[PDB]
Amino acid sequence: MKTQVAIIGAGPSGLLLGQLLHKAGIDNVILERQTPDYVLGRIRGGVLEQGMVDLLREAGVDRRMARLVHEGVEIAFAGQRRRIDLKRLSGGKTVTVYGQTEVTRDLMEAREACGATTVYQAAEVRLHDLQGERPYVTFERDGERLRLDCDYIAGCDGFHGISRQSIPAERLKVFERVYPFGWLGLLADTPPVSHELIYANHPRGFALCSQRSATRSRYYVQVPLSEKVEDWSDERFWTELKARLPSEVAEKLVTGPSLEKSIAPLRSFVVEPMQHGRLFLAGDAAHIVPPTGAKGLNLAASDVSTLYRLLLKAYREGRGELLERYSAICLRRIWKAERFSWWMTSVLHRFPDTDAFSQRIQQTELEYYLGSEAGLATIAENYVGLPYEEIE
């Protein structure tokens, strides 16, 4: 098999890169380890910055202006709830709520409608000859070892993908912080308790209220790492959730059986550079932010945007070396999103063995940022997403 760009991973990153490359007449084949249904079973997040919404349209999808709303942000702490006027504070921008499952299903449909190639259940993917002019990928599909020749490989295979693991260790510098807690998330077929995303810092720990539609909700509470999802019945989750929200919010919460429940570990992770020879990492394969800041998929989007654009230029100009700037460009946006996601996480969660001083400083941090126009502006401008870097 042969193509121009071999894409590893049919998650949002790989599917979006695939659409953009196709639109620009660049052949690509995507190889995905799991089944289509398995990929679609991932719930993940629901907040998109405007950079992403336009890119989706530009990629030939987003024809579902419905099933997809705009919402504001609220932070509850120490007995109060402060709404962040995103629109007024950020120069007219806002975020869109849209489940990652729907985004992914939307891109899967846009690819299928193009007849483009996607190989699901591609096992044992291995990358080869990254420094050569003819790199290739080997994999197994129902018993047979297949091979895919290409000019470039985009590793869009997530945190535990094979592509970051195919770059010689010594070429990479790794930055990582692993948080001492995870997010127990619950998807429910109930109307959301607010039309505002609600982040809550509470003595018992963090909680978050979000939504997917008028009758579908998404909630999270932080939990320690020794906790197992089977130890948390739906009822136990709802009780802990209420115990962490302002009673005004809590009394009006409609509960119901979970449609999906899982615990996600939190971590900040970055590699530099994010490429090696003909391989370019994008999204979670190259970096991870804790979901507190809702930046993951949005960063994946801009990585994909830059990659798409630098590839297009290289072909058009018959010059690969332009591709050398990919890492530097992406990294500038990555680090800002890492700082904001780290900040949000650090001010909103309860950490183990925090002394009195630390606890008060965290409280004062919230008071100042939620009570000062300048403070509020730093939050809103970062949350709606900073400017799409220059690229090229």
Ligand X SMILES: Cc1cc2nc3c(=O)[nH]c(=O)nc-3n(C[C@H](O)[C@H](O)[C@H](O)COP(=O)(O)OP(=O)(O)OC[C@H]3O[C@@H](n4cnc5c(N)ncnc54)[C@H](O)[C@@H]3O)c2cc1C
Among ligand X, a second copy, none, the one that 296 touches (CB under a kind-dependent 5 to 8 A) is: ligand X
Whether 368 is a known active-site residue: answer no
Whether 295 is a known active-site residue: answer yes
Among a second copy, ligand X, none, the one that 125 touches (CB under a kind-dependent 5 to 8 A) is: ligand X
* Interface residue list for a second copy (CB under 8 A): 173-177, 268, 270, 335-336, 338-339, 342, 355-358, 360-361, 364-365, 367-368, 372, 374-375, 377-378, 381
From its phi and psi, is residue 337 left (phi > 0), alpha (psi between -120 and 50) or beta?
alpha
Closer Cβ to ligand X, 144 or 373, answer by number: 144
Query: 371: burial class by Cβ within 10 Å (0-12, 13-18, 19+)?
Result: exposed
Helices (H) and strands (E) in the chain, counts: 11, 20
Contact between residue 164 and residue 281 where contact means Cβ atoms under 8 Å apart: yes
Give the angle 98-103-107 at the CA atoms, nearest 5°: 160
Judged by CB under 6 A, does residue 4 bind ligand X?
Answer: no
Q: What's the CA gap between 9 and 75, in Å, rounded?
A: 35
Contact between residue 32 and residue 119 where contact means Cβ atoms under 8 Å apart: yes
Among a second copy, ligand X, none, the one that 162 touches (CB under a kind-dependent 5 to 8 A) is: ligand X
Active-site position among 22, 287, 295, 349: 295
Judged by CB under 6 A, does residue 125 bind ligand X?
Answer: yes
Closer Cβ to ligand X, 273 or 283, answer by number: 283
> Shortest gap between Cβ of 183 and ligand X (angstroms)?
5
Judged by CB under 6 A, does residue 11 bind ligand X?
Answer: yes
- Of 5, 156, 329, 330, the one binding ligand X by CB under 6 A: 156
Whether 383 is a known active-site residue: answer yes
Contact between residue 119 and residue 30 where contact means Cβ atoms under 8 Å apart: yes
Q: Is beta strand 69-71 parallel, antiparallel or unpaired with respect to 173-188?
A: unpaired
Contact between residue 340 and residue 379 where contact means Cβ atoms under 8 Å apart: no
Q: Which stretch binds ligand X (CB under 6 A): 150-158, 201-209, 339-347, 356-364?
A: 150-158
Neighbours of 338 (CB within 10 A): 23
Active-site position among 23, 70, 195, 313: 70
136: which 2 tokens?
């290739």
Q: Could you say which residues in the range 247-286 bind ligand X, by CB under 6 A?
A: 264, 283-284
Residues classed as catalytic: 70, 199, 291, 295, 383
Instruction: Report the interface residues with ligand X, using CB under 6 A.
Output: 8-14, 31-34, 39, 44-47, 100, 122, 125, 156-158, 160-162, 183, 185, 264, 283-284, 291, 294-298, 300
